[PDB]
Amino acid sequence: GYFCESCRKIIQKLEDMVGPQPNEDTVTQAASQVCDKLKILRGLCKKIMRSFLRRISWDILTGKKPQAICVDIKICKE
């Protein structure tokens, strides 16, 4: 709840930043900083990344879409 918007916005800015076919480090840095950079929603993102870091790496590495990521790791409204 709310989170689906938040998570979609968070992931999409990450996806856009890291670009195509990224790797485990670049996703880790680009995401821990996707959040840092995304002002207002900074705390929400940094908490998601702390709680699900290597998952958000798999998610991006598999180029999986935001709606499906947020449903999968259970953040949206399945």
Side-chain angles (χ1 to χ4, degrees):
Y2 179 57
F3 282 12
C4 201
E5 172 284 321
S6 321
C7 177
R8 183 253 166 135
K9 182 173 283 161
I10 283 164
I11 279 154
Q12 289 245 259
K13 187 74 235 74
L14 201 187
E15 184 178 31
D16 159 332
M17 279 172 36
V18 82
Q21 292 74 269
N23 67 298
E24 176 92 287
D25 176 73
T26 311
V27 186
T28 295
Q29 53 164 292
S32 51
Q33 301 306 94
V34 82
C35 300
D36 202 279
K37 194 190 301 287
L38 279 162
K39 58 170 179 279
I40 304 303
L41 201 62
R42 176 177 171 105
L44 199 292
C45 191
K46 298 289 272 209
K47 189 172 181 178
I48 288 175
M49 279 50 179
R50 197 271 165 269
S51 201
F52 303 106
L53 201 317
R54 202 271 158 255
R55 279 294 269 190
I56 309 321
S57 181
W58 137 75
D59 282 307
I60 279 53
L61 291 165
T62 51
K64 186 149 56 82
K65 279 28 273 169
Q67 169 280 339
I69 295 163
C70 307
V71 168
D72 175 320
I73 71 200
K74 196 188 258 64
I75 292 178
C76 184
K77 176 277 101 210
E78 313 190 310

